[PDB]
């Protein structure tokens, strides 16, 4: 009976979500889809044990299995190493999976028709990709800064004048990119638009920085022809470079439903729980999905002592849906996506029905305006999901 | 009878606004306040005549008279030089006044309680300052880029590795700043908060770029102590550096009423006509105010042929109010500010009364939802202003 998803890697999370992660697993995941879960613990409690080697292993799993998902996980900081008695600050597993897989992260909030928004006229979400090191130095006194490319083989030096500092000091910075890096940001950006079937819009500041951002605009349009052009004329999708303002002008002058690639990592007006992050590798195969929000300190301080907490587990539900929908298309299981496709609405319908958790309730009438009879708490929201779903399956399957 | 404003420079504008500028002058300005207007034409039609020398003169006026105002004006571009038969593309008078006066531009939309917004819970506007050249180069092949500070006197070279490029090429850029430039951005930022009496919040990406953005955070807090500290403890105002997200988190988690200084020029969610730009020189004296929006191609194509147009002249009205309120405090004329203070509400009340121009009407029900009986057109909106004002004066003065 259970549906066949094959190999879907998974990252055991942390703190409050880790149970939300289990609650989601226990409820909306396990009773329905059979899978190959290689489930690795990214808990910092497993990061004092194996000395980080699970994480790079975890990354390698996706690189083979082609699909990870990730619950929220703590980045070790000042409080952690003292309060968890950590052997060392371990590298941020967000970047620790990214740097390994490379890849581009596409954040988007989810559209619930009844909740407030930066734009009431956004029907479909704007999926915002972004590119993201840099050297910086304080040039404490007058002098001529020069950023000089010196070739590797002995070829002519390339001299540039950043500025010649006279009155007072200055400050400066280097910044760089690679065709590898940009084509990484390129294919991953087009593949994201392929799966989402939405228009792609790149934007750089082209006139303000000519050669640097022109290369970005250069490289998509070179790839948007030689590579993706036919797949875009099919299924109507198109790539239009725009200027930042010539884009953000039509940001609200458009409704949504397009992939949007920034050259400049949260921002947005969407409540954190709303947004679902996704990570992809230009290959169009490896796809690592996660919640877009922190590991929820709040609700957790109210967790250990048993009190009633209300937290919105949608971004984590979609981490599965994205993982599963991007699982199916890879393996061509039309059953599995349908499960995933339907589970989105199931998570949307409940709030569309007006039955929603605090943050949504708390944003409707205003922040103190929230009351327990205007929402539902956390553990009880995983109930209605399988409920609504199993029925939204019942007629379907 | 007429009020004494003294010397207030003025920039004759262009296109559709230039008449809005005159309509505002004719109606809400001339019959009430006497002034010393040195009124210079920034029209591109005066930029084929004097060969740009009025502009730098215009800038020098403010530098002495301490107050300019500016109507919108065309930047010469491809269409202009052919259609106006321009002798040359003349430098953008926005930057042509800025570079001369230096100074920082503080954009803000105006708050009308009845109009939609990025945040329904913003009572008072967020005044967004921003800092804003850069060298960029494409390093077509493998090599080691280095940004090397070489001192002016022969002192030890300072070597940095941007990156060493191997597989494929790269791209890079230089970027720089000056204490002069940042303290320019500093004093001008604090003075803006002084006049507006609002909290100042600087934000840089401090942890992502340590030394470069730390210097900014360095310099305000150095100035926020040694200079403005006492004036801020008085009148309760405070300067809190925050991180970009640790700011934008409280952007909507706060209502507004604070000056907000970005290190990174429109953006925003506010309709262009809403926002009023202001330009200030760290001296806290020279203040050049203007509308924040383009010179309105639309309405103008519909202008020459006599048809009924509807365009919202609030940003230009406030250019005077800001110019006049920042005029009074300089010269201590309590009459003149009161005129200016009151004129803001007069421009706010009319729309608060629900009587508003198209864009506001057109944003209330949606863009095609606009109808002529849901708003009022342009020439007729300068009527109600002096009307409401002269009465809002009548009881007052
Ligand atoms: N995995 C990742 O991508 C990220 C991981 N983190 C981890 O986050 C933890 C730090 O907690 P923090 O970063 O402060 O995130 P927190 O959630 O603890 O605080 C951030 C805000 O997000 C909002 N939020 C988060 N989840 C929900 C939800 N389910 N429903 C409603 N609102 C929600 C809350 O606002 P309210 O509850 O008031 O609505 C909360 O105040 C650390 O462990 C850090 O490592 C940090 C950033 C992202
Ligand atoms: N002085 C300055 O700071 C600036 C000057 N410019 C000048 O602007 C001109 C170019 O026109 P553009 O830049 O396209 O600006 P336009 O106004 O011509 O188009 C921009 C949009 O602004 C909106 N807008 C402008 N004024 C109003 C208003 N009073 N009420 C409602 N909406 C308004 C319009 O949207 P709708 O009408 O659909 O509501 C318009 O489509 C050039 O001459 C350029 O030099 C350019 C940028 C700013």
CSV table of N, CA and C in Angstrom, one decimal, chain A residues 103-154:
chain,number,residue,atom,x,y,z
A,103,UNK,N,25.7,24.8,-5.1
A,103,UNK,CA,24.3,25.0,-5.2
A,103,UNK,C,23.7,26.3,-4.7
A,104,UNK,N,22.5,26.6,-5.1
A,104,UNK,CA,21.8,27.9,-4.8
A,104,UNK,C,20.6,27.6,-4.0
A,105,UNK,N,20.3,28.5,-3.1
A,105,UNK,CA,19.2,28.4,-2.2
A,105,UNK,C,18.0,29.3,-2.7
A,106,UNK,N,16.9,28.7,-2.9
A,106,UNK,CA,15.7,29.5,-3.3
A,106,UNK,C,14.7,29.5,-2.2
A,107,UNK,N,14.6,30.7,-1.5
A,107,UNK,CA,13.6,30.9,-0.5
A,107,UNK,C,12.3,31.3,-1.1
A,108,UNK,N,11.2,30.8,-0.5
A,108,UNK,CA,9.9,31.4,-0.8
A,108,UNK,C,9.0,31.2,0.3
A,109,UNK,N,8.2,32.2,0.7
A,109,UNK,CA,7.0,32.0,1.5
A,109,UNK,C,6.0,31.2,0.8
A,110,UNK,N,5.1,30.6,1.5
A,110,UNK,CA,3.9,29.9,0.9
A,110,UNK,C,2.7,30.8,1.0
A,111,UNK,N,1.9,30.7,-0.1
A,111,UNK,CA,0.8,31.6,-0.2
A,111,UNK,C,-0.4,30.9,0.4
A,112,UNK,N,-0.9,31.5,1.5
A,112,UNK,CA,-2.2,31.2,2.0
A,112,UNK,C,-3.1,32.4,1.8
A,113,UNK,N,-4.2,32.1,1.1
A,113,UNK,CA,-5.0,33.2,0.6
A,113,UNK,C,-5.5,34.1,1.7
A,114,UNK,N,-5.7,33.6,2.9
A,114,UNK,CA,-6.3,34.4,3.9
A,114,UNK,C,-5.4,35.2,4.8
A,115,UNK,N,-4.1,35.0,4.7
A,115,UNK,CA,-3.1,35.6,5.6
A,115,UNK,C,-2.6,36.9,5.0
A,116,UNK,N,-2.2,37.9,5.8
A,116,UNK,CA,-1.7,39.2,5.3
A,116,UNK,C,-0.4,39.0,4.5
A,117,UNK,N,0.0,40.0,3.8
A,117,UNK,CA,1.2,39.9,3.0
A,117,UNK,C,1.7,41.3,2.6
A,118,UNK,N,3.0,41.3,2.3
A,118,UNK,CA,3.6,42.5,1.7
A,118,UNK,C,2.8,43.1,0.6
A,119,UNK,N,2.2,42.2,-0.2
A,119,UNK,CA,1.3,42.6,-1.3
A,119,UNK,C,0.1,41.7,-1.3
A,120,UNK,N,-1.1,42.3,-1.0
A,120,UNK,CA,-2.3,41.6,-1.1
A,120,UNK,C,-2.6,41.0,-2.5
A,121,UNK,N,-1.9,41.5,-3.5
A,121,UNK,CA,-2.1,41.1,-4.9
A,121,UNK,C,-1.1,40.1,-5.4
A,122,UNK,N,-0.5,39.4,-4.5
A,122,UNK,CA,0.4,38.3,-4.8
A,122,UNK,C,-0.4,37.0,-4.7
A,123,UNK,N,-0.7,36.4,-5.9
A,123,UNK,CA,-1.4,35.2,-5.9
A,123,UNK,C,-0.4,34.0,-5.7
A,124,UNK,N,0.7,34.0,-6.4
A,124,UNK,CA,1.6,33.0,-6.3
A,124,UNK,C,3.0,33.5,-5.8
A,125,UNK,N,3.7,32.7,-5.1
A,125,UNK,CA,4.9,33.3,-4.3
A,125,UNK,C,6.0,33.6,-5.3
A,126,UNK,N,6.8,34.6,-4.8
A,126,UNK,CA,8.0,35.0,-5.5
A,126,UNK,C,9.1,34.2,-4.9
A,127,UNK,N,9.8,33.3,-5.7
A,127,UNK,CA,10.9,32.5,-5.2
A,127,UNK,C,12.2,33.2,-5.4
A,128,UNK,N,12.8,33.6,-4.4
A,128,UNK,CA,13.9,34.5,-4.4
A,128,UNK,C,15.2,33.7,-4.2
A,129,UNK,N,15.9,33.5,-5.3
A,129,UNK,CA,17.3,33.0,-5.2
A,129,UNK,C,18.2,34.1,-4.9
A,130,UNK,N,19.4,33.7,-4.5
A,130,UNK,CA,20.4,34.8,-4.3
A,130,UNK,C,21.8,34.1,-4.4
A,131,UNK,N,22.8,34.9,-4.7
A,131,UNK,CA,24.1,34.3,-4.9
A,131,UNK,C,24.7,34.1,-3.5
A,132,UNK,N,24.6,35.1,-2.6
A,132,UNK,CA,25.0,35.0,-1.2
A,132,UNK,C,24.8,36.4,-0.6
A,133,UNK,N,33.4,34.8,-0.7
A,133,UNK,CA,33.8,35.6,0.4
A,133,UNK,C,34.4,36.9,-0.1
A,134,UNK,N,34.9,37.7,0.8
A,134,UNK,CA,35.5,39.0,0.5
A,134,UNK,C,36.6,39.4,1.4
A,135,UNK,N,37.7,40.0,0.9
A,135,UNK,CA,38.7,40.6,1.7
A,135,UNK,C,38.4,42.1,1.9
A,136,UNK,N,38.7,42.6,3.1
A,136,UNK,CA,38.5,43.9,3.5
A,136,UNK,C,39.6,44.5,4.4
A,137,UNK,N,40.0,45.7,4.2
A,137,UNK,CA,41.1,46.3,4.9
A,137,UNK,C,41.0,47.8,5.0
A,138,UNK,N,41.6,48.3,6.1
A,138,UNK,CA,41.2,49.6,6.6
A,138,UNK,C,42.1,50.7,6.2
A,139,UNK,N,43.2,50.4,5.4
A,139,UNK,CA,44.1,51.4,4.8
A,139,UNK,C,44.3,52.6,5.7
A,140,UNK,N,44.9,52.4,6.9
A,140,UNK,CA,44.7,53.4,8.0
A,140,UNK,C,45.2,54.8,7.6
A,141,UNK,N,46.0,55.0,6.5
A,141,UNK,CA,46.6,56.2,6.2
A,141,UNK,C,46.6,56.5,4.7
A,142,UNK,N,47.0,57.7,4.3
A,142,UNK,CA,46.9,58.1,2.9
A,142,UNK,C,47.8,57.1,2.1
A,143,UNK,N,47.3,56.8,0.9
A,143,UNK,CA,48.0,55.9,0.0
A,143,UNK,C,47.1,55.6,-1.1
A,144,UNK,N,47.7,54.9,-2.1
A,144,UNK,CA,47.0,54.6,-3.4
A,144,UNK,C,46.7,53.1,-3.3
A,145,UNK,N,45.4,52.8,-3.1
A,145,UNK,CA,45.0,51.4,-3.2
A,145,UNK,C,45.0,51.0,-4.7
A,146,UNK,N,45.4,49.8,-5.0
A,146,UNK,CA,45.3,49.3,-6.3
A,146,UNK,C,44.9,47.8,-6.3
A,147,UNK,N,44.0,47.4,-7.0
A,147,UNK,CA,43.6,46.0,-7.1
A,147,UNK,C,44.2,45.5,-8.5
A,148,UNK,N,45.3,44.7,-8.4
A,148,UNK,CA,46.1,44.4,-9.5
A,148,UNK,C,46.0,42.9,-9.8
A,149,UNK,N,45.4,42.5,-10.9
A,149,UNK,CA,45.4,41.2,-11.3
A,149,UNK,C,46.8,40.8,-11.8
A,150,UNK,N,47.5,39.8,-11.2
A,150,UNK,CA,48.8,39.4,-11.7
A,150,UNK,C,48.6,37.9,-12.3
A,151,UNK,N,48.8,37.8,-13.6
A,151,UNK,CA,48.5,36.5,-14.2
A,151,UNK,C,49.3,35.3,-13.6
A,152,UNK,N,48.9,34.1,-13.9
A,152,UNK,CA,49.5,33.0,-13.3
A,152,UNK,C,50.8,32.6,-14.0
A,153,UNK,N,50.9,32.9,-15.3
A,153,UNK,CA,51.9,32.4,-16.2
A,153,UNK,C,53.0,33.4,-16.4
A,154,UNK,N,52.9,34.6,-15.9
A,154,UNK,CA,53.9,35.7,-16.3
A,154,UNK,C,53.4,36.7,-17.2
